[PDB]
Amino acid sequence: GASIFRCRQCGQTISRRDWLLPHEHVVFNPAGMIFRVWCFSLAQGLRLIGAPSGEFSWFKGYDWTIALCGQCGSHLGWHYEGGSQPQTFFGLIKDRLAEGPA
Numbered sequence: 863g864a865s866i867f868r869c870r871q872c873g874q875t876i877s878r879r880d881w882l883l884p885h886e887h888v889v890f891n892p893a894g895m896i897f898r899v900w901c902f903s904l905a906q907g908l909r910l911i912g913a914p915s916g917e918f919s920w921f922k923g924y925d926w927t928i929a930l931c932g933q934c935g936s937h938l939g940w941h942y943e944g945g946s947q948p949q950t951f952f953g954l955i956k957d958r959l960a961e962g963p964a
């Protein structure tokens with residue numbers, strides 16, 4: 863009953879409890895905004911915007927790209943790339959997702 867993560871704003875399919883990567887990081891951006899981030903190995907239904915940036919990266923050795931909900935454009939988090947073990951992952955804002963049945 864709690865296996866799929868969807869965008870809270872529009873219901874787009876985003877990820878699965880199975881795809882969590884151990885999981886929960888509380889971070890601040892330079893504007894002091896707090897994000898409660900869940901790391902996922904895999905996500906779908908996003909639109910990755912721009913080219914990667916290392917600036918203010920929360921994760922040592924990773925560059926980030928903005929991940930929008932590909933349906934409604936709501937900011938769901940970031941895709942991280944350029945690191946090692948693992949090379950890539952997603953950091954999604956927990957309170958911008960909804961959890962429910964398959």
Ligand SMILES: O=C1CC[C@@H](N2CCCc3ccccc32)C(=O)N1
Binds near residue numbers: 890921940
């Ligand atoms: O690893 C990261 C990702 C985003 C980044 N960040 C910095 C750039 C400005 C900005 C604006 C809104 C949300 C986040 C944000 C961050 O501090 N670290």
Ligand SMILES: [Zn+2]
Binds near residue numbers: 870874934
């Ligand atoms: Zn959405």
